[PDB]
Amino acid sequence: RADQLADESLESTRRMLQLVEESKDAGIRTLVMLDEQGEQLDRVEEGMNHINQDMKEAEKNLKDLGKARENEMDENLEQVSGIIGNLRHMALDMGNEIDTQNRQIDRIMEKADSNKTRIDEANQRATKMLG
């Protein structure tokens, strides 16, 4: 048991790597997207802004027209440590991407709604002058 633990747990330290390494792989796909999506939402936000503009004009037109075993076991830890730093790297990129976009969602939701109203009002004045 004594050795079945100083080695088995040692295998866990070795595994402790792929465990925190597979996490990076899982983090990459996330970050890679969070970044890709970040730029996407930029062109997406343009939509809420593009519509925000046109609607103003559209409304006006509708208004104008409407009217050594332990030595290694100690090293593996250092390995985990070096990787722990990485976990911080992603934790920040993921964090700064989350907070920057959440607030972006706010602006999107705002303008999107603001324009929704203009569409409804215009749709109630246009539907009548149909055909």
Partner: protein, 286 residues
């Protein structure tokens, strides 16, 4: 079908109507028509990877788009142009972007202005190698992000500013930035982990100080050895502060060698550590 044909038709219509042809309403429908033409051309140019032609074409459509009276859509067109030129053959990548921000900024759109502002400072460094002009942008942009309460982005920029400020000898101006970005990081228990590296950078950046500018900054740093995250921060520092106060360019140059084990040094650290390495040598036999 061909872009070379479209550019031609677009040209023969992008002319302010006058006299009888102008009639009662010359209309901006012509200039806009041409804009749509050039956009259609620039795109197929972007197909044959002609880039150069794509970009210059977009510049045309956008330029006319200004004569149309619609600064917004034009601005984003300038962005399209920048996107072409950037990953292209010629330059203008810097021009288009400047021509875009001059529009977003004056239009009252800082939120996006900073978005392209950082892209700008990001190119003016990794390409033009114009650090002095890059930092100015990383900074002004961070001011905008900080204006939009977007702490996160603002810090992303500040790190760049200070990060490259120390490279341009601006060490004190660097530590100040690290101190600010460091204080405005504790209020958020979601940055605690990162707050270390900040203190490490700031304690490393030295404006030729000989005192405890760092020996005091290391103390301000609340740490408890069995924390680790922190071990990758002040531990080494302490050992560096002793090696400097004793003009020993061997204890410091050895510590950088050992520390480069538990935590590899990036190009930044390498360059600075070497500068500090020289501040010792020139000081010993002087």
């Amino acid at each position: 079908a061909e872009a070379m044909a479209l550019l031609a038709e677009a040209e023969r219509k992008v002319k302010n109507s006058q006299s009888f042809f102008s009639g009662l309403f010359g209309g901006s429908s012509k200039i806009e028509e041409a804009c749509e033409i050039y956009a259609r051309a620039a795109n197929m140019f972007k197909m044959a990877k002609n880039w150069s032609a794509a970009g210059n074409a977009f510049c045309q459509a956008a330029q006319l788009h200004l004569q149309l009276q619609s600064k917004h859509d034009a601005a984003t067109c300038f962005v399209d142009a920048g996107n072409a030129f950037k990953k292209a053959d010629p330059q203008e990548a810097i021009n288009c972007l400047m021509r875009a921000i001059e529009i977003y900024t004056d239009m009252g759109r800082f939120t996006i202005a900073a978005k392209h502002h950082i892209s700008i400072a990001e190119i003016y460094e990794t390409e033009l190698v114009d650090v002095e002009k890059a930092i100015a942008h990383y900074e002004q942009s961070a001011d905008y992000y900080k204006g939009e309460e977007s702490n996160s982005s603002a810090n992303k920029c500040l790190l760049k500013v200070a990060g490259y400020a120390a490279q341009l000898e601006q060490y004190q101006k660097a530590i100040d930035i690290y101190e600010q970005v460091g204080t405005s990081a504790m209020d958020s228990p979601l940055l605690k982990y990162s707050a270390k590296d900040y203190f490490f950078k700031a304690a490393l950046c030295h404006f030729c100080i000989d005192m405890l500018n760092a020996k005091l900054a290391v103390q301000k740093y609340e740490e408890l050895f069995p924390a680790f995250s922190d071990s990758r921060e002040c531990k080494l520092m302490k050992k560096l502060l002793e090696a400097h106060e004793e003009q020993n360019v061997d204890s410091y140059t050895e510590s950088v060698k050992e520390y480069d084990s538990i935590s590899r040094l990036d190009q930044w650290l390498t360059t600075m550590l070497l500068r500090i390495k020289k501040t010792i040598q020139g000081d010993e036999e002087d």
